[model samples]
Target: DPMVSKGEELFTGVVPILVELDGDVNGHKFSVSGEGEGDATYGKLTLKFICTTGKLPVPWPTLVTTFLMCFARYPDHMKQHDFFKSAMPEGYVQERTIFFKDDGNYKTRAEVKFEGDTLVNRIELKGIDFKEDGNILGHKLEYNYNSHNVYIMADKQKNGIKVNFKIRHNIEDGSVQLADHYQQNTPIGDGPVLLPDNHYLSYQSALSKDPNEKRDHMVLLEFVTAAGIT
Candidate 1:
């Protein structure tokens, strides 16, 4: 568990300082993207929040908006985000996706896509509220091309680009949930940062029948960044 401990310590303290020290580069732009276990792929639930920045987190928050709103008091999420910017490497960019949750019994799903640097796209969140007589009240939440009101970078990619994908799952469950074995060594800078082979095991139990017991869980952290002279 030293790896987890080391990551936690560095993030809560060292991370903020790193982002601060870097300051601004030529200052073109930056972004974040990410993903967790998908139900179709694993059946195990996942919540993904990917960001474009440096360093990462364990037990990371999935919704920047929800997370910010939930703890707006004290050391708010905005403050936390601002603090994280300081930890990024110089010329560092960000992209991420944090999964929210996956309910197995219900047929519910959501996805987000971007058109180049534009937030103009469609949003699809669907679900059905069943009635006792088998009647269904299906609800659809959508964002039109113009309604892709997500806050994103103002410009397009200048460099080759990079990416990091992280995943998390409940332990009482099983790694049998993972569906894919991501086996490609995409080069980063001079070498390659190998994506995990998949079929992941939960580092610790996320849920328990006995409330008194404590458990530790593992997080899948994937990071990508691009550096090229524009």
Candidate 2:
């Protein structure tokens, strides 16, 4: 018999930035007629993604499968630890995704891919509107401290979201956690982001010689994502 399987833990947690109005969601068994204190320890939540189907096997046979999930979780009574972990075999990769309607009623989608703890490839935001002369981070971008609300990105691209802890708590179900929480504030810069310098490398640049050329005050976009709430 041939063994064919693959997988790994991609991310710790991702913020759930969007909420489906009674007009849109309740995927799992979340139809309006439900109520429960929910038992302790563990249970499961199934997020249903209808319409989307999958094809499988050697010839990629047409199979009737969607993003239907029935993953494990701590019971509703188990608040001490919202145990939400995912493990899928190699054929599939899990990436954090978020969807939020902007203040102007526009739907925004964001995604981040991670291979366990290492920060892998991602879309780097450009032209960050750093309120304080492109040096300090911006607060005006968010509705409030940790509001986690979707806002315009550094590149003036509206509907950018930088999910934080409070944003995590605001979701109905599991929150995606990122490894880097350093780049405080919203997503920044049109190009590569860098920290503000004043004392020495205020004008962070170098002559391409000795000690190697380097970006000193490099400020990268850091923070955390979204999944469904069943």
- In the range 1-230, model 1's lDDT, one tens digit per residue, is 33223212323321110011111112212233433322111112232333345432121221121110000111221222221122221112232232323311121112122223221111121222222222111111111111001121112132222222332332222321111111111111332111211111211112112234133221232121211211
> Once superposed on the true structure, which residue ranges of model 2 sit more than 4 Å away at CA?
1-6, 9-119, 127-129, 134-163, 166-214, 217-230
Evaluate candidate 1 by giving its C-alpha RMSD to the native, one decimal.
18.7
User: Where does the lowest 10-residue lDDT sum fall in candidate 1?
Assistant: 14-23
What TM-score against the true fold does each predicted structure earn?
0.19, 0.19
Local distance difference test, each candidate: 0.21, 0.18
Query: Could you tell me how far off, in angstroms, the CA of residue 42 lies in candidate 2 after the best superposition?
Result: 24
Which 10-residue window of candidate 2 scores lowest in summed lDDT? Answer: 57-66
Q: Evaluate model 1: give its lDDT.
A: 0.21
